[PDB]
Nucleic acid binder design. Structure first.
Ligand SMILES: [Mg+2]
Ligand SMILES: [Mg+2]
Ligand SMILES: [Mg+2]
Ligand SMILES: [Mg+2]
Ligand SMILES: [Mg+2]
Ligand SMILES: [Mg+2]
Ligand SMILES: [Mg+2]
Ligand SMILES: [Mg+2]
Ligand SMILES: [Mg+2]
Ligand SMILES: [Mg+2]
Ligand SMILES: [Mg+2]
Ligand SMILES: [Zn+2]
Lengths: 216, 144, 174, 37
RNA sequence: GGGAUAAGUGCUGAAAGCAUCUAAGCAUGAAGCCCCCCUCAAGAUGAGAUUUCCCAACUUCGGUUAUAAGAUCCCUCAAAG
RNA sequence: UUGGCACCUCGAUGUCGGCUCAUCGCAUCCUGGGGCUGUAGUCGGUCCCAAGGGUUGGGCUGUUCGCCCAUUAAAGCGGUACGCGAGCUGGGUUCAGAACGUCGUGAGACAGUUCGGUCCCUAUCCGUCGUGGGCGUAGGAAAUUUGAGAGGAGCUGUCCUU
């Protein structure tokens, strides 16, 4: 099992051998390094901690996340690696194969590999029940004073309360989503890009976590 | 004249004990442990303070049930979500989590008050024979 | 329990060792070990083993009968073993031995394979008769039951895997 | 199987037994099979 | 896919010399149960773990202090609102 | 269900149907697993286990029902103030107008009909859905996390091959 971290550059299409159009998402997986290796002996579970995308080294009066802080720099230095913006663990990958400070490359993944891609979905802000929960609108005429309302929120004296998990208006998006059984169309070592068939969760410039499909 | 002694944190001293759950009925072990946790066996027992002693229970896995409790006895919990009722049989609970079975039995036999909650916290249950509280220097207790 | 009271004879070749409730019976074909009921008391003689119920209570009587029968089965099993013959019936129904495992073809698009077990022997004669032989009576029976379960006998034509001496009720098709 | 409160022999062959705390009738004739319930 | 099961189906087996799926014992058996898959989750007050960073003077010797690592105010913003 | 009773509410507990949103039971409509069959096969009948998921659009009528059309794996039955009007509608019913039949000497009346006919309310508390702050978690911090718990999902057709 293999895992790489990347940013979602955007979507495009590629023409297949048969001339079939394949919609694809461009992912850049440059600057991936194994920052730490966790084992059952020490941490109680086996995983590799991988850092993606180098950030600037510590400076005295850094006011932003662009420059690494002292605590982060130390953790990266232990791996003999530059400070990283994003760090994520991969439990799927075997600990023995990877070594601390080892670069993880796009070439690990190959074309035709079935993969599961994880990312935070795009944020929609505060949303009503119709958009958020796919509920039906009320009549738009015939005396209607019900259009985009949530509907009844309960019964009457029995219960005399709203049950937990009642679908109501609230903030929508920003959730972690894993799309399963996507495929790698192409891997570009030169550009450090992996082409993934279909669309992956989240905004452009959003971190995507590509793993080998759990279901096989 | 008012002469009844009242225990206070200054004059209260709590000991540590170890009880083996091997070949012991859950209820009968639990009932006795609850009294030790409450401090009912102390002559200086005062209701509004905790005079009770800490208890360690070992070999929780070896607790015994009678009849068909292993299958028939069911523990229901509700999640507070509609239709959110979950069930575990006593036998299955013993296998999966031996400690929880013992704890819940004893905690059910303690008063549902702020003091009562504290008295339950003094209970430590371990499914294996070994316990991690050697520093506390517990004394082996034999159920009467 | 008349059965319980009856002594279990030991063949001279067979050697039986009792360890508390548990009994280990050693025979030329194999050695069988089981744990008998704790209450039941067993008196061992070279010629034969005698089991006596501790009390006349029903529970002891039932266990006495079971214990006696079980012990007898082990001794006889190690001495001679138990063999059960299963016969496939109907056209296109055949049995073939792949190594230890038995492969059966019984009107199924997929071929059926049954894994062999320790202290059990699978053998096919004429491609229609299968014999399961083992020291353990139970183990022989269990594996035989699995073989029969693959395709049980049908009433209308009698097609299927059956025990050699099994009787099947017959219903007229039309 | 016939599941009924009144489980009794329909013929001579039928044999009344108790399995898993439930009275049942077992017979050569499959029809005669019953289970108390 | 796995484990445990229902109605079932048995294997061995006595009470009850026979019989018997059950009593002891041993199997098998559902879109159902517990998992497997997905998301949240240590206010899990039982508050867990791993890695890394910071680490001094005063003082009535009780402790205090601003500072360290770090984070903010304020400001330019959006992939967030 | 139709009733009986008159125990809460007459200094007000809004009443049918639909819409919106569900939630629960299982006496199971479909799908899953079985026993028996007057079960050849394909199909069925009947009974047992099973509530995970699913369980359509129209014509007529205020309708609920029901009938019909065309589907479907199936078009389940019930409870939740005949769920849900500080969520919606207001066609029926249950004000004032008018008319017909009918009854009444009449004024008028009719679980007879007909046409028309004002649906208020800025959420305090619990509850529910989101989103912050304080303190705690025996030094102060930056990250990466385990999962006690909890939620989600869970459906099926047809065709080919054998
Ligand atoms: Mg609509
Ligand atoms: Mg409007
Ligand atoms: Mg209301
Ligand atoms: Mg009758
Ligand atoms: Mg009265
Ligand atoms: Mg009032
Ligand atoms: Mg039922
Ligand atoms: Mg109503
Ligand atoms: Mg009206
Ligand atoms: Mg009028
Ligand atoms: Mg009237
Ligand atoms: Zn009969």
């Amino acid at each position: 099992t293999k895992g790489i971290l990347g940013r979602k550059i955007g979507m495009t299409q590629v023409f297949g051998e048969n001339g079939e159009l394949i919609p694809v998402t461009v992912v850049e997986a440059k600057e991936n390094v194994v920052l730490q290796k966790k084992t059952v002996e020490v941490d109680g579970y086996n995983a590799i901690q991988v850092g993606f995308e180098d950030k600037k080294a510590y400076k005295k009066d850094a006011k932003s996340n662009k420059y690494a802080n002292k605590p982060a720099e130390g953790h990266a230095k232990k791996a003999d690696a530059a400070p990283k913006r994003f760090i994520r663990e991969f439990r799927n990958v075997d600990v023995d194969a990877y070594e601390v400070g080892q670069e993880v490359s796009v070439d690990t993944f190959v074309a035709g590999d079935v993969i599961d891609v994880t990312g935070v979905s795009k944020g929609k802000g505060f949303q009503g029940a119709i958009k958020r929960h796919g509920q039906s609108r009320g009549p738009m005429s015939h005396g209607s004073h019900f259009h985009r309302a949530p509907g009844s929120v309960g019964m009457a004296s029995d219960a005399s309360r709203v049950f937990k998990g009642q679908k109501m208006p609230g903030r929508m998006g920003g959730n972690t989503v894993t799309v399963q059984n996507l495929e790698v169309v192409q891997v570009d070592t030169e550009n450090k890009v992996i082409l993934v068939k279909g669309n992956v969760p989240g905004p452009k410039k959003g971190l995507v976590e590509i793993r080998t499909s759990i279901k096989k | 004249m008012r002469q009844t002694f009242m225990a206070n944190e200054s004059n209260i001293e709590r000991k540590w004990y170890v009880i083996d759950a091997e070949g012991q009925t859950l209820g009968r072990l639990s009932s006795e442990v609850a009294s030790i946790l409450r401090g009912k066996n102390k002559v200086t027992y005062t209701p509004h303070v905790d005079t009770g002693d800490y208890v360690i229970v070992i070999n929780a896995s070896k607790i015994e049930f009678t009849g068909n409790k292993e299958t028939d006895k069911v523990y229901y919990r509700h999640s507070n979500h509609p239709g959110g009722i979950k069930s575990i049989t006593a036998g299955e609970l013993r296998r999966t989590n031996p400690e929880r079975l013992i704890e819940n039995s004893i905690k059910g036999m303690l008063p549902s008050t702020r003091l009562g909650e504290k008295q339950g916290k003094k209970l430590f249950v371990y499914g294996g024979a070994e316990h991690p509280h050697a520093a506390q220097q517990p004394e082996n207790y034999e159920l009467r | 329990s008349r059965v319980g009271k009856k002594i279990i004879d030991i063949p001279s070749d067979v050697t039986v060792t009792f360890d508390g409730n548990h009994v280990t019976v050693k025979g030329p074909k194999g050695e069988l070990s089981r744990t008998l009921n704790e209450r039941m008391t067993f008196k061992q003689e070279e010629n034969t083993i005698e089991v006596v119920r501790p009390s006349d209570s029903k529970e002891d009587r039932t266990n006495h009968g079971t214990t006696r029968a079980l012990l007898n089965n082990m001794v006889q099993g190690v001495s001679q073993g138990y063999v059960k013959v299963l016969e496939l019936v109907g056209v296109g129904y055949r049995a073939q031995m792949q190594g230890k495992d038995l492969i059966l073809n019984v009107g199924y698009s997929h071929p059926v394979e049954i894994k062999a077990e320790e202290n059990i022997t699978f053998s096919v004669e004429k491609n229609t008769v299968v014999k399961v032989e083992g020291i353990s009576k139970e183990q022989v029976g269990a594996l035989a039951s699995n073989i029969r379960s693959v395709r049980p006998p049908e009433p209308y034509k009698g097609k299927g895997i059956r025990y050699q001496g099994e009787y099947v009720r017959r219903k007229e098709g039309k | 199987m016939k599941v009924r409160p009144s489980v009794k022999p329909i013929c001579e062959k039928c044999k009344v037994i108790k399995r898993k705390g439930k009275v049942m009738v077992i017979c050569e004739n499959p029809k005669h099979k019953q289970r108390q319930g």
